[PDB]
Design an enzyme around this catalytic site. Structure first.
Site, PDB file in Angstrom:
ATOM      1  N   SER B  91      14.144   8.060 -11.742  1.00  0.00           N
ATOM      2  CA  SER B  91      14.805   8.462 -10.284  1.00  0.00           C
ATOM      3  C   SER B  91      15.524   7.193  -9.782  1.00  0.00           C
ATOM      4  O   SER B  91      16.396   6.737  -9.110  1.00  0.00           O
ATOM      5  CB  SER B  91      15.159   9.168  -9.863  1.00  0.00           C
ATOM      6  OG  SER B  91      15.754  10.728 -10.749  1.00  0.00           O
ATOM      7  N   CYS B 134       6.246   6.199  -8.529  1.00  0.00           N
ATOM      8  CA  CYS B 134       4.485   6.679  -8.154  1.00  0.00           C
ATOM      9  C   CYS B 134       4.527   5.504  -7.903  1.00  0.00           C
ATOM     10  O   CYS B 134       3.966   3.671  -7.705  1.00  0.00           O
ATOM     11  CB  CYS B 134       3.892   6.253  -9.705  1.00  0.00           C
ATOM     12  SG  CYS B 134       4.965   7.664 -10.885  1.00  0.00           S
ATOM     13  N   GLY B 162       7.027   8.024  -3.807  1.00  0.00           N
ATOM     14  CA  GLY B 162       6.307   9.315  -4.178  1.00  0.00           C
ATOM     15  C   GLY B 162       5.181   8.443  -3.660  1.00  0.00           C
ATOM     16  O   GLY B 162       4.151   7.564  -4.899  1.00  0.00           O
ATOM     17  N   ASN B 307       0.093   9.887  -8.784  1.00  0.00           N
ATOM     18  CA  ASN B 307       1.077  10.012  -7.703  1.00  0.00           C
ATOM     19  C   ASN B 307       1.552  11.538  -7.844  1.00  0.00           C
ATOM     20  O   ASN B 307       1.133  12.685  -7.984  1.00  0.00           O
ATOM     21  CB  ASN B 307       2.142   9.992  -8.749  1.00  0.00           C
ATOM     22  CG  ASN B 307       2.397  10.493  -9.776  1.00  0.00           C
ATOM     23  OD1 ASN B 307       3.311  10.886 -10.135  1.00  0.00           O
ATOM     24  ND2 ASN B 307       1.239  10.223 -10.833  1.00  0.00           N
ATOM     25  N   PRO B 308       2.282  11.715  -6.561  1.00  0.00           N
ATOM     26  CA  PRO B 308       2.416  13.739  -6.219  1.00  0.00           C
ATOM     27  C   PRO B 308       2.451  14.688  -7.741  1.00  0.00           C
ATOM     28  O   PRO B 308       1.879  15.314  -7.158  1.00  0.00           O
ATOM     29  CB  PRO B 308       3.601  13.851  -5.533  1.00  0.00           C
ATOM     30  CG  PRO B 308       4.006  12.481  -4.852  1.00  0.00           C
ATOM     31  CD  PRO B 308       3.014  11.611  -5.667  1.00  0.00           C
ATOM     32  N   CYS B 309       2.987  14.492  -8.833  1.00  0.00           N
ATOM     33  CA  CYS B 309       3.038  14.986 -10.050  1.00  0.00           C
ATOM     34  C   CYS B 309       2.050  15.368 -10.529  1.00  0.00           C
ATOM     35  O   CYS B 309       2.397  15.470 -11.730  1.00  0.00           O
ATOM     36  CB  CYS B 309       4.303  14.500 -10.670  1.00  0.00           C
ATOM     37  SG  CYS B 309       6.330  15.373  -9.242  1.00  0.00           S
ATOM     38  N   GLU B 311       0.898  12.683 -13.239  1.00  0.00           N
ATOM     39  CA  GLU B 311       1.006  11.857 -13.966  1.00  0.00           C
ATOM     40  C   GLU B 311       0.787  10.510 -14.617  1.00  0.00           C
ATOM     41  O   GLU B 311      -0.053   9.954 -16.209  1.00  0.00           O
ATOM     42  CB  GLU B 311       2.118  11.667 -14.752  1.00  0.00           C
ATOM     43  CG  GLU B 311       3.497  11.557 -14.668  1.00  0.00           C
ATOM     44  CD  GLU B 311       4.485  11.465 -13.549  1.00  0.00           C
ATOM     45  OE1 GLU B 311       3.513  12.024 -12.256  1.00  0.00           O
ATOM     46  OE2 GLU B 311       5.193  10.878 -13.521  1.00  0.00           O
ATOM     47  N   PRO B 477       7.534  14.833 -15.226  1.00  0.00           N
ATOM     48  CA  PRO B 477       8.189  16.135 -15.360  1.00  0.00           C
ATOM     49  C   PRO B 477       9.645  16.256 -16.096  1.00  0.00           C
ATOM     50  O   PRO B 477      10.151  16.741 -16.171  1.00  0.00           O
ATOM     51  CB  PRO B 477       7.870  16.894 -13.759  1.00  0.00           C
ATOM     52  CG  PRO B 477       7.495  15.878 -12.829  1.00  0.00           C
ATOM     53  CD  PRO B 477       6.525  14.312 -13.874  1.00  0.00           C
TER      54      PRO B 477
END
Ligand SMILES: Cc1cn([C@H]2C[C@H](O)[C@@H](COP(=O)(O)OP(=O)(O)OP(=O)(O)O)O2)c(=O)[nH]c1=O
Ligand SMILES: Cc1cn([C@H]2C[C@H](O)[C@@H](COP(=O)(O)OP(=O)(O)OP(=O)(O)O)O2)c(=O)[nH]c1=O
Ligand SMILES: Cc1cn([C@H]2C[C@H](O)[C@@H](COP(=O)(O)OP(=O)(O)OP(=O)(O)O)O2)c(=O)[nH]c1=O
Ligand SMILES: Cc1cn([C@H]2C[C@H](O)[C@@H](COP(=O)(O)OP(=O)(O)OP(=O)(O)O)O2)c(=O)[nH]c1=O
Ligand SMILES: [Mg+2]
Ligand SMILES: [Mg+2]
Lengths: 622, 603
Positions: B91, B134, B162, B307-309, B311, B477
């Site tokens: 994004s 990230c 993030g 990073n927050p997710c 991956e 995600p």
């Protein structure tokens, strides 16, 4: 009486058990292990005196063939005045003097000191060797500047400073942010971040918003119901106090606006004031900061600008400026019905030098602060013990007599402080920014209003002389002195005694815990010991002598407490002192529980007519 | 099928009405006044493609007398794949490509483009031209470093990144601080400051290692860290930790700048993690040792956080940009079109690697750590709808064997493209000191589930000489970008078929569709609806039809051929128990996963 004689009267008088607890608690140095390096006030005085005397290494007027002699002479006079508790610098000086320095050098007998010992002390001052109480940092209108300032709050707090900002640069809530096609949080919402930061560096701060900021109403209400629990909050008045009072009298309107916002609003000033008074009546916040009045008397204005005070309000500071404080206990200068002006002048002399030396041995966590302080050398010499001095002199605090006395006492101190600053500029060099200051570029600039003392003409004469030589931009304040007045067993700042008697409980380790009675020392010595015994109980229940039967009138009129003194008499005492202070003043305007919001409003209006630079106000409210 | 043919099949298929809303709400560029500069997906694809193509300015393999035509060719292939929605970058790339650049240069026709137009685009990228999702920053054990990091969080968050940190450097609560009479507040108290900062700029990752004295407090932390995802870090080998658990051993909680020491039973620590995960979904597990096992630059550099997710595991100040291929679009007559796919993998790596050169970061150290490593995160989305088309149930060995082969294939060709780009443009600065160089049979993932393995080893050996990127792969995600591309998210099963799924519309009459539609919107599955053909039920499974181990084993099959990590939720039925969670953990420690997220339905 010579200072040396007065020193002899006090030097072997030991702090009371109450003071000793405080000293053990926070002041006595300890090692990494938690063992005491200091067990006696004397040890603190030894260390502090040695570190500050060390600044005499830098003295360009001394020949090397002479340096160790001189340093040792300053060490001993500084030592003698601190031990006697006649002058005590602000707490950070007593906490942090000699941090970084080998423990073998800080307490060893002065006779054993070598020039290389003093040089090693100078060398080994660590990044924690921070000796000043008061700080201001800007908070500019960008994410990058806001978070650099949050970092600065953290760093300054670590080393033991108190910091303030004016937050008015921050664009109002809801205003356009270019980067985000979003909307600004505004100052009050960013102040929570500074609050969260600090509340974790402490498992008080000053936040100012100007009266014409669109978020001012939100600000005024920010501590009602307090999310900003680490902030004292003052409303900022950067315009003239006269314009504001005129606008109020005409029931005029104020335009709230911001340069980086399209948000404009008109409010009735009377209504803004009432909202401030209602909140202050409830909780004590926000105060008033007369920033324009501070700049009126700022030698460097408009080149440099005062936008905020430190947390307690007594020093108005420009951006990144800091200021170190110390206080003379004037209750110790009482001699047979008079204040010993001879011993006092010698001490003002010493104190100004001690404080000016603190700058040279001071280490700050931020280069811009180091630079701002080198450039200006602003001091805050003040007094404590003034209430107990009035008690001794038999003067009611709430009397024109007391305020006349206060203005003369302050005027005398002012005179000899600024004279000493002259002498120091000659001896050591002027503050870098002398040339661009109003002491130079003007005739007849005086950094306070005067108008209440015989000393005025002499003061004018000294101010003119400081066009040539001047060590410091400004020299004077009255601070709260919470802790150092406790150490000195004396009353705080220029404040009346809050109480004449209270129970201070001493913890027998062990045993359990003891009910120990305090009675004011001066009361103990004037009042008939058999009267004391009778009324003692009623005095603790009631907080005043005023409605106690069979205590002579003259004792009731002299031994007034904070709440016997009405709001205007508080206000006028502040005015009396401020006329002869170049910085500001720490004064609580105490108000009876039965005061109304209109009573608060009337204090504010009176404040605007007097020479006070700021306002703090109500018993039973918190 | 050639990629150009597959492009022709999708290029004029218009985003759905759902997708268009999303695009209008946050992706279409607007001016200072709030007017749209872009009104359709093709405008975004034009702008992004042009900006990323601009990176070919820097290509030393091009003469100047050639550069224009080369750049235009890249703009065009980039434009076509993006417009077709066959590959979509993360994004930030969509939001921020072209910021600072004259609006007449970004959508102008490609045939009018001059070399000076491209050079102007390159030159006028502003400080907000941040294109990477990230980030990781260190949080060192001093007031100075903590509040610099809070500053960095604010700055990174501002530009759309993030950020994650490992907080373990912060001495435990109550420890001795030299400065003061006070004691240390602890990592967790400090994490609240990060949370306050961000609450005013707004999502975050906070890790604390299993052997930190404050770990139990950390585990309980979210039982005013509303912006934090929280994971427990395991810097040790997964083998040691599983061994200790099985032997009912004890762990020594300690910190180098504390005297605070304590022993806890690992089994008890795990039960406490599982209990909290069982309640609220937090904290997850971050197998840091396992990330570092496959980190080309370890131990001279070290991965401490994601990073927050989750991956991407990142070293200090490193950042990473992501992009995803919609594999559902690559379905042809019962097969995945590997021919078009390999061409796109080739293009996607170049696109993603070019993104680095036109990226602008707000912190010099980040700029530098990215230039040095050039880490990419190429992934896939659409996987679950691919399995629908192929009539494969997600919860079957057939699906996982399919997944491993597919991921193996993508790995092969991404790393082959990396080698090619090293030759063409220059290697990543740190190749020489990486294990691609200093070792013999270094492979950045476990493998062991495909016939492509020998070919993969062969390409890894080749990348001793030439290699553009330290690491190339991830599964993200893809929440938004899969919405844009009208496909399923990452490698996740569809969470729901109706709230209808397009592959389910195209396969079930209707009539049975019209009838069941509301029962399927209550019951949330096809499972306990009668009069639906058993073949339809088996294939068209949703997240909660798939038991926890099938989730976990699907994550393992992918991770075997991903050099970074994987974003995967281990969905659990509402009736799952704390012991069911612990069993997932123990199984996780035996598989090749690099982290764990659980979510019990109803939590
Ligand atoms: C980015 C951002 C800024 N702000 C506030 C912080 C400052 O008070 C003010 C400006 O922030 P800046 O960081 O200066 O924003 P900017 O430079 O991207 O936009 P501008 O050109 O308009 O300066 O806006 C927010 O409140 N929230 C945000 O998310
Ligand atoms: C640890 C600790 C420190 N202190 C210290 C922190 C401050 O440096 C000191 C205040 O003592 P003073 O030097 O008397 O400060 P002041 O009240 O005159 O105000 P100013 O800050 O304007 O100089 O109190 C406490 O009050 N309580 C504590 O528990
Ligand atoms: C100063 C201070 C530090 N800390 C924590 C922050 C970091 O986790 C850690 C280090 O802070 P530092 O800022 O490093 O303290 P120092 O370096 O002067 O002394 P020491 O090396 O002994 O710490 O202590 C607090 O929690 N509260 C504080 O008031
Ligand atoms: C699923 C979903 C995601 N999002 C948003 C949150 C982010 O702003 C945006 C990011 O684009 P994504 O495609 O979500 O990026 P990602 O999900 O792959 O996560 P990352 O790259 O960090 O690993 O997705 C929504 O706003 N709503 C949603 O329903
Ligand atoms: Mg800006
Ligand atoms: Mg430190």
């Amino acid at each position: 009486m010579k200072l040396s004689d007065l020193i002899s009267r006090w030097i072997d008088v030991e702090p009371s058990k109450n003071a000793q607890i405080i000293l053990r608690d926070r002041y006595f140095m300890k090692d990494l292990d938690g063992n005491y390096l200091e067990t006696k006030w004397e040890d603190v005085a030894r260390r502090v005196a040695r570190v500050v005397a060390t600044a005499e290494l830098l003295n360009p007027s001394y020949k090397k063939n002479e340096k160790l002699d001189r340093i040792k002479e300053w060490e001993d006079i500084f030592f003698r005045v601190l031990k006697a508790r006649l002058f005590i610098p602000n707490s950070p000086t007593l906490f942090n003097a000699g941090l970084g320095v080998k423990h073998d050098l800080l307490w060893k007998p002065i006779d054993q000191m070598t020039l290389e010992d003093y040089e090693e002390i100078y060398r080994s001052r660590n990044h924690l060797h921070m000796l000043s109480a008061c700080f201001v940092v800007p908070v500019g209108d960008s994410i990058e500047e806001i978070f650099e300032a949050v970092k600065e709050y953290a760093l300054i707090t670590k080393v033991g400073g108190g910091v303030g900002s004016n937050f008015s640069e921050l664009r109002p809530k809801g205003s356009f942010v270019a980067g985000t096609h979003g909307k600004a949080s505004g100052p009050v919402s960013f102040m929570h971040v500074f609050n969260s930061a600090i509340s974790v560096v402490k498992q008080a701060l000053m936040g100012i918003l100007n009266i014409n900021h669109p978020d001012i109403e939100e600000f005024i209400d920010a501590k009602k119901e307090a999310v900003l629990n680490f902030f004292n909050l003052s409303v900022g008045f950067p315009m003239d106090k006269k314009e504001i009072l005129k606008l109020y009298e005409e029931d005029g309107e104020l335009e709230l606006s911001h340069p980086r916002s399209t948000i404009r609003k008109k409010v009735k000033i009377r209504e803004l004031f009432r909202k401030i008074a209602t909140n202050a009546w409830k909780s004590g916040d926000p105060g008033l900061a007369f920033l324009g009045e501070m700049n009126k008397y700022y030698p460097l204005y408009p080149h440099r600008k005062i936008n905020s005070t430190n947390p307690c309000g007594e020093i108005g500071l420009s951006d990144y400026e800091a200021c170190n404080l110390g206080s003379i206990d004037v209750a110790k200068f009482y001699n047979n019905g008079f204040v010993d002006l001879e011993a006092l002048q010698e001490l003002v002399q010493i104190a100004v030098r001690f404080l000016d030396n603190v700058i040279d041995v001071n280490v700050f966590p931020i280069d811009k602060i180091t630079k701002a302080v080198k450039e200006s050398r602003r001091l805050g010499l003040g007094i404590m013990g003034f209430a107990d001095l009035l008690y001794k002199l038999e003067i009611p605090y709430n009397s024109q007599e007391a305020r006349d006395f206060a203005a003369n006492l302050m005027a005398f101190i002012a005179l000899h402080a600024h004279r000493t600053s002259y002498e120091l500029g000659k001896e050591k060099g002027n503050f870098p920014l002398l040339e661009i200051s109003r002491y130079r570029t003007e005739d007849n600039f005086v950094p306070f209003a005067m108008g209440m003392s015989n000393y005025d003409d002499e003061i004018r004469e000294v101010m003119k002389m400081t066009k040539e030589f001047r060590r410091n931009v400004a020299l004077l304040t009255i601070a709260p002195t919470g802790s150092i007045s406790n150490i000195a067993d004396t009353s705080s700042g220029l404040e009346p005694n809050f109480l004449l008697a209270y129970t201070r409980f001493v913890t027998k380790e062990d045993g359990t815990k003891e009910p120990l009675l305090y009675v004011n020392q001066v009361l103990r010595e004037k009042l008939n010991p058999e009267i004391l015994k009778r009324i003692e109980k009623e005095l603790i229940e009631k907080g005043s002598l005023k409605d106690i039967p069979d205590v002579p009138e003259k004792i009731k009129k002299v031994f007034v407490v904070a709440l016997d003194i009405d709001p205007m008499d508080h206000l006028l005492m502040q005015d009396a002192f401020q006329r002869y202070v170049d910085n500001n003043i720490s004064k609580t305007i105490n108000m009876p529980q039965s005061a109304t919001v209109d009573d608060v409003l009337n204090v504010y209006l009176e404040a605007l007519r007097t020479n006070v630079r700021g306002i703090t106000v109500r018993d039973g409210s918190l």
